[PDB]
């Protein structure tokens with residue numbers, strides 16, 4: 001379907017638009033290249049580990065690698081729906097969002113290659129709860145936007161990505177990675193990558209907040225919908241946390257060896273503090 | 286529609302894939318930031334010009350600003366269709382393609398702002414030929430790919446963007462800009478931007494070639510279709526060149542003042558040499 005004009009021909013970019021200023025920040029803080037990370041110490045770290053120590057890390061990497069790959073694939077219809085609405089500055093920023101996520105895919109995959117598990121299918125650490133979120137709910141809500149770009153649809157997609165997948169699971173995964181492998185002194189390259197990812201992530205979450213708020217600002221029913229969709233997914237969020245927790249408890253070798261007082265009941269509550277504060281971040285007026 | 290697995294969980298990125306290697310090159314050669322370009326000399330250059338000298342440059346800027354904006358908006362469905370086919374490395378690269386184009390939009394718009402024409406609607410330098418290409422044929426062929434991602438559809442979209450809009454009009458516009466304002470010593474910031482754009486453009490065109498060839502490599506009927514779609518658009522390509530040419534001839538002030546032996550019958554043939562060599566770039570086997 002045709003264009004009925006071009007904003008930068010009729011006029012200019014809206015230089016004061018929040019998403020244009022988020023875009024400017026993204027060019028300035030998003031120059032990191034996964035190809036420049038040195039994973040060699042990570043290769044030795046992983047080899048030194050016993051088989052059962054090796055398993056300790058793989059479930060978390062598996063959730064991240066599918067997660068990054070899913071968001072790289074699924075964000076495209078959201079960028080397209082905002083394009084079609086003529087929200088040019090949103091689109092400019094989303095280009096950085098998408099390049100970020102592609103770097104995220106690349107980072108974890110280079111790590112898997114370098115530590116020697118590239119040939120290994122980590123699909124087995126995705127339980128049904130995880131599948132529900134990443135294999136189903138994320139692509140469903142995003143792809144919807146081809147045929148139905150209503151505020152209700154935009155709210156739902158922004159919630160699924162920005163406030164659950166990223167704002168809850170991803171952020172908790174950054175925290176879990178530090179609480180564990182930063183302490184044991186393991187996987188320096190991976191944790192460098194995690195740092196970069198966490199910095200990128202702040203812009204991603206801010207885009208989701210800006211999106212969700214601007215729709216709630218029109219009509220407050222949409223605050224209710226926001227919350228309803230958050231809560232509708234929480235059981236699958238926590239069912240995946242419990243699944244991963246029950247895995248670390250039954251594979252204590254890495255914690256024992258590297259003398260980690262690994263507190264799963266605290267990671268868990270961090271997930272809850274993340275989920276609840278994402279709700280807080282959306283003002284109802 | 287769901288995911289049936291993730292490549293970087295089952296396996297890894299295909300590190301030897303051409304589009305992964307194009308992606309690596311894009312991160313390394315695509316760090317330029319339009320916000321760092323100094324347009325101040327351009328502001329003085331544009332002010333010094335007489336009204337009729339001012340008009341000389343605006344038609345070319347108008348075609349570029351709509352063009353960049355159009356490709357930023359319209360490439361999204363191609364990235365989505367390749368995502369859905371599971372061509373992960375294509376998608377990784379397309380993220381750089383899209384960020385590039387967003388920088389392209391930004392560059393020309395910052396220039397318009399800085400030289401003082403942001404408030405001016407340059408839609409009047411788009412004739413019906415130009416509209417046919419950029420307002421209609423480009424979004425049509427790209428958007429098709431939501432519902433019809435057949436090789437015939439992918440060939441057509443890659444041809445419209447990579448071998449006409451970019452491979453013919455954009456490249457000739459880089460050449461026209463040097464032949465004119467590089468000679469007169471005008472608009473240093475703009476021409477810096479044009480240089481960067483031209484470097485980016487080489488990856489864009491290579492993606493279109495790789496796309497078109499990989500489909501022709503299956504079945505040779507698609508070489509015929511490639512050519513048929515090129516030629517089907519040429520009348521609108523040249524009708525826009527003639528339109529812009531007939532404008533420079535009737536506004537000789539800028540050429541007279543800055544003593545430019547501006548040869549439109551040579552720019553024109555450059556357009557023809559660009560169009561014909563894009564055809565050459567697609568081997569039929």
Ligand SMILES: CCCCCCCCCCCCCCCC(=O)O
Pocket residue numbers: 060063064067068071101104165166169170172173176201204241244245248264267268271
């Ligand atoms: C045992 C405590 C569990 C801690 C929670 C760990 C969750 C793993 C994270 C995987 C999901 C990654 C989603 C990426 C989102 C993005 O790229 O924006």
Ligand SMILES: CCCCCCCCCCCCCCCC(=O)O
Pocket residue numbers: 345348349352353356386389450451454455457458461486489526529530533549552553556
């Ligand atoms: C008088 C001689 C005419 C010379 C031809 C000039 C054509 C102007 C270019 C405008 C189209 C720009 C398309 C951008 C494509 C891209 O960003 O890949």
Ligand SMILES: [Fe+3]
Pocket residue numbers: 068071100101104197
């Ligand atoms: Fe990410």
Ligand SMILES: [Fe+3]
Pocket residue numbers: 071101166201204
């Ligand atoms: Fe993210």
Ligand SMILES: [Fe+3]
Pocket residue numbers: 353356385386389482
């Ligand atoms: Fe461009």
Ligand SMILES: [Fe+3]
Pocket residue numbers: 356386451486489
């Ligand atoms: Fe281009």
